[PDB]
Amino acid sequence: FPVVLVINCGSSSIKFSVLDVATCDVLMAGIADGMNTENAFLSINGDKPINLAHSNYEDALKAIAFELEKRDLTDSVALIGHRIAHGGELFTQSVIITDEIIDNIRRVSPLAPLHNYANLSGIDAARHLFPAVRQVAVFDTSFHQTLAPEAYLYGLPWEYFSSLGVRRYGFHGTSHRYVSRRAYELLDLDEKDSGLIVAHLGNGASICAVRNGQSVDTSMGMTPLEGLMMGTRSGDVDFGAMAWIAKETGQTLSDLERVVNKESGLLGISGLSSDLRVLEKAWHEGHERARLAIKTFVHRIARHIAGHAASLHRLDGIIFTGGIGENSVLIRQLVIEHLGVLGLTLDVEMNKQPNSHGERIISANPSQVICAVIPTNEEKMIALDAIHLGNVKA
Amino acid sequence: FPVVLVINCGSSSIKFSVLDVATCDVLMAGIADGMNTENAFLSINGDKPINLAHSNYEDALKAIAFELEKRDLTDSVALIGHRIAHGGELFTQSVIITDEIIDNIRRVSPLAPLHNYANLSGIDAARHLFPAVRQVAVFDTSFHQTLAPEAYLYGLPWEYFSSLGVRRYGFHGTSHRYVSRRAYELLDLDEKDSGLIVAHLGNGASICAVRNGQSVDTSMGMTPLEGLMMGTRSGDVDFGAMAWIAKETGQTLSDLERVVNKESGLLGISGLSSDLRVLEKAWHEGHERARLAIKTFVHRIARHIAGHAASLHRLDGIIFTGGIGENSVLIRQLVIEHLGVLGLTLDVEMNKQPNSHGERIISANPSQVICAVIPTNEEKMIALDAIHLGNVKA
Numbered sequence A, B: 001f002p003v004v005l006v007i008n009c010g011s012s013s014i015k016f017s018v019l020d021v022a023t024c025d026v027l028m029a030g031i032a033d034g035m036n037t038e039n040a041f042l043s044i045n046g047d048k049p050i051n052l053a054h055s056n057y058e059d060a061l062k063a064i065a066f067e068l069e070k071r072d073l074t075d076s077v078a079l080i081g082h083r084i085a086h087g088g089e090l091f092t093q094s095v096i097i098t099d100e101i102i103d104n105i106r107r108v109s110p111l112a113p114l115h116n117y118a119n120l121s122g123i124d125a126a127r128h129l130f131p132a133v134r135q136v137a138v139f140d141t142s143f144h145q146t147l148a149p150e151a152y153l154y155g156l157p158w159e160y161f162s163s164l165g166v167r168r169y170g171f172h173g174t175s176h177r178y179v180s181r182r183a184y185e186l187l188d189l190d191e192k193d194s195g196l197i198v199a200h201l202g203n204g205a206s207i208c209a210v211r212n213g214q215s216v217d218t219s220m221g222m223t224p225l226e227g228l229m230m231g232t233r234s235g236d237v238d239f240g241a242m243a244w245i246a247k248e249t250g251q252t253l254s255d256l257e258r259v260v261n262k263e264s265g266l267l268g269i270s271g272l273s274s275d276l277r278v279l280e281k282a283w284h285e286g287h288e289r290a291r292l293a294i295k296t297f298v299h300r301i302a303r304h305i306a307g308h309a310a311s312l313h314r315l316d317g318i319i320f321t322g323g324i325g326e327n328s329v330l331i332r333q334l335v336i337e338h339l340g341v342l343g344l345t346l347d348v349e350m351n352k353q354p355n356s357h358g359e360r361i362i363s364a365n366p367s368q369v370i371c372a373v374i375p376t377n378e379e380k381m382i383a384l385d386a387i388h389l390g391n392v393k394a
């Protein structure tokens, strides 16, 4: 009864999951949170908060690995999937990890210094602890390499693209990929004759146009800072204004990189929370700055959704996913309210239902376009890729 | 037989026109080009290139004023209109120039140091040379103050908006205003029940959503650097990428402000020209970089047009204007080609015709939305405002 191990090595954390090959069901989940710090803890299911003080990426994985042998799971780890943040232009699909892969990942790491270099430390540690186990590298950017130049190029001088590698890459590729695959079934569509818009909304957020199967436009840019206004992230911002602010407050480019990435967004406007559950309540309690933060949020999502639709020959569906998209009744309706121009009519009884109802249509009959919610499973997709790559003979 | 004098004091030039009150027709046009330099010339109609060596904003206007008395026009200058670049949040409409106005213009000048401070020098000089003549200040930003916060706020911290005044303002307001007014007549619409998209495309470029008469969304931001990719201007650009480039080439914020504003855009990609007539030919001659520069241009216009439509309850028309929009057959069709999602069908015989045909529908019957071209007249609108403000008793 074989399983697949899934690893995501963030900036300050290691998120892991164990899935069954037969069912693709989670049999264990956990997190090694607060990495590299004076005190680092491991938490499986949120039941054991085992401390490890000053421990790094390798030492954590060793602790996690023990907690699998402790539960007699070591001998069943058939495959190991690794979430990779930035694949650049070198990775179009999912691959079996080899020296060539590690080497190519090292090459593109310049594009995302924080995330990528942690992923490599997660690969190397897994390479170590699991020898005969075939490993797979899954890229958050690969789904997007189907974009045309006219859609990925920036309005900057060519030198930057050809020499320095400056271009739009877009993120949440695995989420946008999975969600769209599922969307073909639920909406009874033809992948080769389809036009979808996928709104991944949560911690970080992006839109993606999926034409006839492939990604043809996405909101996030070279970094995850472009597109929609997000939790702590500003979203689209006038560079002439950023350069102006630099001249006023005397702040540096590095200073503003922090403000834009960590102090801006939903938090930035509200001066309250980078979280909807709070802000949604704050509005109802009469807070205006929070009401604006959400109206502004909603507005920028509708602008991009409708804008991304221009990359499709015909619009068939609009899909919500991520923490916010799946769970938030209000933002869903507010975003449709805004996109009445496309002849969208929402079925409020269908939109009322929580995330327990899973995959669900939320639009009515008169509506020109079908709306739906599909819970993303970044983990399931990583597994499926590896299970497929398991049949491969290297 | 009264006339109106129109003045536009750019960074390095003074563009002027003389219009008849009865007909709103141009009776004289000219330019004082290459200002403040070692040699500064004046050119009426392009017939006399009178040099003035080292001459400033006041001395040029004196020379222009003589060339009106020389043609017996001084005694007929009933009104003087002044193009003002940046009105901030203080000016919602056109006004008669008074001390209070000059004072308020001084207050908002921080938002556009280059343009605004030249406009004031144009007002002061005209104040001088014409005493009893009533003067009018017309703002390139005023039409846009009808925007909701959710549409003008940036994803930055609130402090910047409330204290520092950071927000979207949008430009080409007079062009977007005039064009839309005309569009109601040509398309037989009801201003109070209308939804237009106006694409001003030329030197600099912007889109504007006009719902039930008023501006509800525009592409340009606080500065004229946001929105579409333009001639020398980059357009929308990932700030995470600009901060990344800063870390690579070691360039400063001021360095990049120049690259983005002057070295980027159509010129930036092509490495050839900041002008379409050339690039349109280059493509046909087999140049790829120019072909991309235009495909990229087209694409970013369609993204914003469709995106701005989300600010309308219903889409009735799409309007092209400016040097590029009025004159370019190809870009018009390429932009419609891209916006097939909205059910746009273009009548190519109608699109073939040059700018001599003036105001003209270019879409067919099957098309869900009417397309049209309307030649902007920033000057005529400035006059009309002043002629209206001429009836006012101060």
Ligand SMILES: Nc1nc2c(ncn2[C@@H]2O[C@H](COP(=O)(O)O)[C@@H](O)[C@H]2O)c(=O)[nH]1
Binding pocket: A201, A202, A203, A204, A231, A274, A275, A276, A277, A278, A280, A322, A323, A324, A327, A328, A329
């Ligand atoms: N309205 C609402 N928002 C939620 C709920 N659960 C999570 N969220 C939002 O989803 C975000 C987390 O996104 P995630 O990391 O899961 O993609 C949080 O900012 C939070 O506000 C819920 O039950 N209701």
Ligand SMILES: Nc1nc2c(ncn2[C@@H]2O[C@H](COP(=O)(O)O)[C@@H](O)[C@H]2O)c(=O)[nH]1
Binding pocket: B201, B202, B203, B204, B231, B274, B275, B276, B277, B278, B280, B322, B323, B324, B327, B328, B329
């Ligand atoms: N294709 C084409 N483009 C033109 C023509 N005249 C002007 N343009 C374009 O319009 C731009 C000038 O915009 P303007 O300053 O008039 O708003 C130039 O970049 C130029 O390429 C024309 O006859 N054909």
